[PDB]
Amino acid sequence: LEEQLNKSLKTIASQKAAIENYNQLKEDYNTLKRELSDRDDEVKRLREDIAKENELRTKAEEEADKLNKEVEDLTASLFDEANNLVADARMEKYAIEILNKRLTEQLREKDMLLDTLTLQL
Amino acid sequence: LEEQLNKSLKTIASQKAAIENYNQLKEDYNTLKRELSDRDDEVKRLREDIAKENELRTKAEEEADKLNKEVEDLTASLFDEANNLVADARMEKYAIEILNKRLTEQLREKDMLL
């Protein structure tokens, strides 16, 4: 009987630390069950703010391109007209520089004709 | 030994179930600790992209204004040559205009005295 007092006792303990440990493990299990419900929701959030980026970054990339190929055009168009502005600019500066120089090359054919139209009179 | 054949089988039955608990639990623990370490990766990867991805939006946004000013300068510089031109290209019109006035009236002044 006295040797029956420690047999059951040694088993009472096996049972004791039997739970004591299970909890000593489910407490640490739950110590993860949450930390994983964090990377689980941290991922979701980041994961979303990335399609939140790409989407609003493809509107800016395709619009700032459109509105930058519109400027590329107006620059070749401004450069263009700015040449025609030069074509006529120079062109018209001849006919009037030659004209001004045509009455001159024309004065030598009438300046000599006054020293002689006075040779008769 | 039917008495000793029962309790012993029940004592053992609960021993198994006792262990079984810890084993299918530790088993479910090593699992959580794994994923929690497979998401640390899936989050260190995300925060690794928003880094190079935002460091790439950087240059693509800097050499973007480094452009409009080498275009703005170009544009408005073209526009001054075009205005300084038409502007003073007109000064030489009325200037060479009066020169052609004395010449057209002096050739007629060369017809009154001739």
From Swiss-Prot, chain A:
Annotated localization: Bud neck; Bud tip; Cytoplasmic vesicle, Secretory vesicle
Q: Which domain of life is it from?
A: Eukaryota
> Coiled coil: which residue ranges?
1-121
Q: What does this protein do?
A: Guanine nucleotide exchange factor for SEC4, catalyzing the dissociation of GDP from SEC4 and also potently promoting binding of GTP. Activation of SEC4 by SEC2 is needed for the directed transport of vesicles to sites of exocytosis. Binds the Rab GTPase YPT32, but does not have exchange activity on YPT32.
| Family in the record | Belongs to the SEC2 family.
The entry's other comment says: Present with 13200 molecules/cell in log phase SD medium.
| Entry domain remark | The N-terminal domain (1-374) is sufficient for the exchange factor activity.
Q: How does it assemble?
A: Interacts with SEC4. Interacts with YPT32, preferentially in its GTP-bound form.
What is the name attached to this protein's record? Answer: Rab guanine nucleotide exchange factor SEC2
